[PDB]
Scaffold this active site. Structure first.
Site, short mmCIF file in Angstrom:
data_model
loop_
_atom_site.label_atom_id
_atom_site.label_comp_id
_atom_site.label_asym_id
_atom_site.label_seq_id
_atom_site.Cartn_x
_atom_site.Cartn_y
_atom_site.Cartn_z
CG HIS B 327 -1.64 5.28 -0.37
ND1 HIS B 327 -1.39 4.52 0.04
CD2 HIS B 327 -2.14 5.15 -1.73
CE1 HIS B 327 -1.69 3.29 -0.79
NE2 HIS B 327 -2.30 3.83 -1.95
CD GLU B 357 -5.12 -0.25 4.03
OE1 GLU B 357 -3.90 -0.83 4.58
OE2 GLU B 357 -5.33 0.00 2.66
CG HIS B 487 0.80 -0.99 -11.14
ND1 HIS B 487 -0.54 -0.46 -11.55
CD2 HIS B 487 0.77 -1.11 -10.06
CE1 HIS B 487 -1.45 -0.08 -10.81
NE2 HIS B 487 -0.40 -0.52 -9.31
#
Ligand SMILES: *[C@@H]1O[C@H](CO)[C@@H](O)[C@H](O)[C@H]1NC(C)=O
Ligand SMILES: *[C@@H]1O[C@H](CO)[C@@H](O)[C@H](O)[C@H]1NC(C)=O
Ligand SMILES: *[C@@H]1O[C@H](CO)[C@@H](O)[C@H](O)[C@H]1NC(C)=O
Ligand SMILES: *[C@@H]1O[C@H](CO)[C@@H](O)[C@H](O)[C@H]1NC(C)=O
Ligand SMILES: *[C@@H]1O[C@H](CO)[C@@H](O)[C@H](O)[C@H]1NC(C)=O
Ligand SMILES: *[C@@H]1O[C@H](CO)[C@@H](O)[C@H](O)[C@H]1NC(C)=O
Ligand SMILES: *[C@@H]1O[C@H](CO)[C@@H](O)[C@H](O)[C@H]1NC(C)=O
Lengths: 201, 595
Positions: B327, B357, B487
């Protein structure tokens, strides 16, 4: 005149073990010939900022006593080793006077002072009742009384141990890597000045 | 002598001990994530345990300082962050039951295996196979079988768990002086004590509603267009006047519509802007991909990467012998240590993800000067928004022509802009009604507005009314259809995606007007613009010290969420969708006319 009896700068700069900034080491230097060539030659220095005297004319102007103060701090605090500065190190660990005549030298020491488990042998004073006077040390381990209740020697709430560890690790950022600092303070007194640099002919 | 000075000294001692313990915890988590071995697992567990115990005892010592006599805003903010009870306010039995419930929901979701009846010799998991069968298949009954089977099994095994979960979280929030658990989640956006920039917990819902009311026309046109294209895919099952069938949205839950680009392409004849072939021809390794992202970040004026970043990040998959989590994650370990965990492949998607990122890492780098408990985004949306703006700027044809991936003879006509904007709309505009619906359902179920025996009937009705998606078959209360998403099953706030989506385009307009871009918003690049980087870095340096309204005022000159940048971004696509929805019917009916 031949050149001999050089001042022991190898003992201060190339020591295997430096000191914590709270118990900063002070070595007096007298009755020898001090050549500053070796210091200038050394490349790794992060700061060579000098105050009151020029670095170029170190070898000719000469003094009575030379004090070499050695300690280890974190990179972010190297700016605090200067006249007129504030911080934890300046207020509580190492203070320079506003009329400081000398030089400050700092260099990175990851290969010597960083451990993977964490080097917990370098300490600093985080809490103190009043600011430090110039060239003063405090090696007391008395519990800092931050509140109104007496500490009675035992830490806890509103009573903190003043010495906190510099847990150095090799993977830290450049502002947090261990930096070795040597402060050279030059003083002149009524005594004959006996620390004088080399002569050429 | 006063309480405020005691709080400052306590915060100094907390900051030193917190940064050391946090660094150890983060280093152990990094060692587990890049090297999955059982000693790393127990090391990460021990460090996490010591960190959790440390925050428990520090919060216990922190609640001895009352907040009403503290006037400094930064000290008050740090003490408010520190004094939060969390789950500790309950009894030990109820807290243990809540942690047991959360752990078993996590294990059910992670290890949920649903397969074909009469073939039980091996079965298929959600992440390897169900995602592929939901995103790639074009068969109606196959998608129906996968959708109904997974929701049926997961809902029957998760419905009483959620039934206890809502009650326990509601008790936790009401013990913590909150109205409901939804109020506890909305408390992240709460700003108190600052004049003019005050933001309430209660205000967020109408603000979200106020934004969604202006989202609704554009989405309707997109919905109509998607429906028309799905009519080409499925001839008789979908109605012109009705909603979309739920299992045809390209994902398991309908969260993203980005898997419909093949079916809903505006101009299939036009090529895409995929630059993977240029990378493989020119031998662009992962190191140089990150170097290009760093060059982009120093073009805008942000600081370059640290030496420890290049030394300690693992930017390539290590091999078969060493297992690592694939990930993409940006790590702020503390003490000036910033790393990226990314198994980079030589693709355009990994290039954009690397930009995203590194935007996360730059955001983490800027607030290093802040105190430890304020080292976060001003709200939960900003952190992802500042990475998504980099993903927006790096994907432009101008940036790809600048760095040599795209040829200088590439023709940027309106058709490729339309299809690129439709891909961006399926990713971005598609998720907004789903996100708002899911959060509003969760807010009412925590509030008690929805009765206990009316959950599914309410939820599906809102999916008909808000998202415009109809269920295939009616579901009774034996099912727990919301809980099939990652979630909601694992106790995560979901409104961060909606707020992030709005903040993304707001930041993009602010930077593009800062960088003097004279064209449409989607073509804008913030490269070679120092002033735009300075304007962004003014918000990046604050961290959590200032209210998010004040940070937003620092960037876009507004203190509240605005939807005008998002609609301004999708303006030519909006005109095109208005043009081609003349024959079709815009809008939907809540009847079950398709199915
Ligand atoms: C310390 O050791 C190095 C190693 O070569 C040497 O060059 C240097 O002269 C020594 N002394 C000082 C003061 O750096
Ligand atoms: C990963 O863990 C294994 C455990 O056996 C160890 O041998 C190896 O050195 C580790 N990898 C790295 C890069 O440290
Ligand atoms: C709040 O405290 C910080 C240090 O903890 C200080 O720098 C700042 O000036 C204070 N703010 C006010 C308004 O006193
Ligand atoms: C946290 O819980 C304790 C336990 O009763 C309570 O005294 C304290 O007021 C709580 N803190 C807050 C901020 O509600
Ligand atoms: C970052 O940039 C500075 C100057 O802009 C440069 O001195 C430094 O070497 C760069 N960092 C790396 C890792 O090259
Ligand atoms: C693109 O521009 C040309 C120029 O006249 C126009 O004819 C065409 O309809 C436009 N296409 C789209 C999809 O906007
Ligand atoms: C940014 O600056 C570099 C160096 O001057 C240049 O090569 C590059 O083309 C510029 N980018 C754009 C988009 O013009």
């Amino acid at each position: 005149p031949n050149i001999t009896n050089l001042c022991p700068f190898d003992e201060v700069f190339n020591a295997t073990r430096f000191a914590s900034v709270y118990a900063w080491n002070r070595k007096r230097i007298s009755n020898c010939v001090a050549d500053y060539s070796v210091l200038y030659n050394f490349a790794p220095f992060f700061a060579f900022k000098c105050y009151g005297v020029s670095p170029t004319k170190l070898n000719d102007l000469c003094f009575t006593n030379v004090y070499a103060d050695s300690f280890v701090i974190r990179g972010n605090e190297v700016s605090q080793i200067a006249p007129g500065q504030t911080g934890n190190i300046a207020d509580y660990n190492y203070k320079l006077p506003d009329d400081f005549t000398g030089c400050v030298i700092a260099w990175n020491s990851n290969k010597l002072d960083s451990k993977v488990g964490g080097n917990y042998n370098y300490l600093y004073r985080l809490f103190r009742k009043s600011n430090l006077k110039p060239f003063e040390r405090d090696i007391s381990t008395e519990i800092y009384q931050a509140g109104n209740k007496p500490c009675n020697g035992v830490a806890g709430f509103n009573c903190y141990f003043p010495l906190r560890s510099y847990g150095f690790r090799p993977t830290y950022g450049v502002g947090h890597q261990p930096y070795r600092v040597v402060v050279l303070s030059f003083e002149l007194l009524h005594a004959p000045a006996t620390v004088c640099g080399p002569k050429k002919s | 002598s006063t309480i405020e000075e005691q709080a400052k000294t306590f915060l100094d001692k907390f900051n030193h001990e917190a940064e050391d313990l946090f660094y150890q915890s983060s280093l152990a988590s990094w060692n587990y994530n890049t090297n999955i071995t059982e000693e790393n697992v127990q090391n990460m567990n021990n460090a996490g345990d010591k960190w959790s115990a440390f925050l428990k005892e520090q919060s216990t010592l922190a609640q001895m300082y009352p907040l009403q006599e503290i006037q400094n805003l930064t000290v008050k903010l740090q003490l408010q962050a520190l004094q939060q009870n969390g789950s500790s306010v309950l009894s030990e039995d109820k807290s243990k039951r809540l942690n047991t419930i959360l752990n078993t929901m996590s294990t059910i979701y992670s290890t949920g295996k649903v397969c074909n009846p009469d073939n039980p010799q091996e079965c298929l998991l959600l992440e390897p196979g169900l995602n592929e069968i939901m995103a790639n298949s074009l068969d109606y009954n196959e998608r129906l079988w996968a959708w109904e089977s997974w929701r049926s099994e997961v809902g029957k095994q998760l419905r009483p768990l959620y039934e206890e979960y809502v009650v326990l979280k509601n008790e936790m929030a009401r013990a913590n002086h909150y109205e409901d658990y939804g109020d506890y989640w909305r408390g992240d956006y709460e700003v108190n004590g600052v004049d003019g920039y005050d933001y309430s917990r209660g205000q967020l819902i109408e603000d979200v509603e106020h934004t969604f009311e202006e989202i609704k026309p554009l989405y309707e046109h997109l919905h109509a267009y998607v429906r028309a294209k799905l009519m080409n895919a499925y001839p008789s099952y979908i109605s012109p006047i009705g909603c979309l069938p739920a299992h045809l949205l390209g994902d398991m839950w309908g969260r993203f519509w980005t898997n419909l680009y093949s079916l809903t392409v505006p101009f299939g004849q036009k090529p895409n802007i995929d630059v993977t072939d240029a990378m493989v021809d020119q031998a662009w390794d992962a190191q140089r991909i990150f170097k290009e992202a760093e060059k982009f970040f120093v073009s805008v004026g942000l600081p370059n990467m640290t030496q420890g970043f290049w030394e300690n990040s693992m930017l390539t998959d290590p091999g078969n012998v060493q297992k690592a989590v694939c990930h993409p994650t940006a790590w702020d370990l503390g003490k000036g240590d910033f790393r990226i965990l990314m198994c980079t492949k030589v693709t355009m998607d990994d290039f954009l993800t690397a930009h995203h990122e590194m935007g996360h890492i730059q955001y983490d780098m800027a607030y290093a000067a802040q105190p430890f408990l304020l080292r976060n985004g001003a709200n939960e949306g900003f952190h992802e928004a500042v990475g998504e703006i980099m993903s927006l700027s790096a994907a432009t044809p101008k940036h790809l022509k600048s760095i040599g991936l795209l040829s200088p003879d590439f023709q940027e006509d309106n058709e490729t802009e339309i299809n690129f904007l439709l891909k961006q709309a399926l990713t971005i505009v598609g998720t907004l009604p789903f996100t708002y619906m899911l959060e509003k359902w969760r807010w009412m179920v925590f509030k008690g507005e929805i009765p206990k025996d009316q959950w599914m009937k309410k939820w599906w009705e809102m999916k008909r009314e808000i998202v415009g998606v109809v269920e295939p078959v009616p579901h009774d209360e034996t099912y727990c259809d919301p809980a099939s998403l990652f979630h909601v099953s694992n106790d995560y706030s979901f409104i961060r995606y909606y707020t992030r989506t709005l903040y993304q385009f707001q930041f993009q307009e602010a930077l593009c007007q800062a960088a003097k871009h004279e064209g449409p918003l989607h073509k804008c690049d913030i490269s070679n613009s120092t002033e735009a980087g300075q304007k962004l870095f003014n918000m990046l340096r604050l961290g959590k010290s200032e209210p998010w309204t004040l940070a937003l005022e620092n960037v876009v000159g507004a203190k509240n969420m605005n939807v005008r940048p998002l609609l301004n971004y999708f303006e030519p696509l909006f005109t095109w969708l208005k043009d081609q929805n003349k024959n079709s019917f815009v809008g939907w009916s809540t009847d079950w006319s398709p199915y």
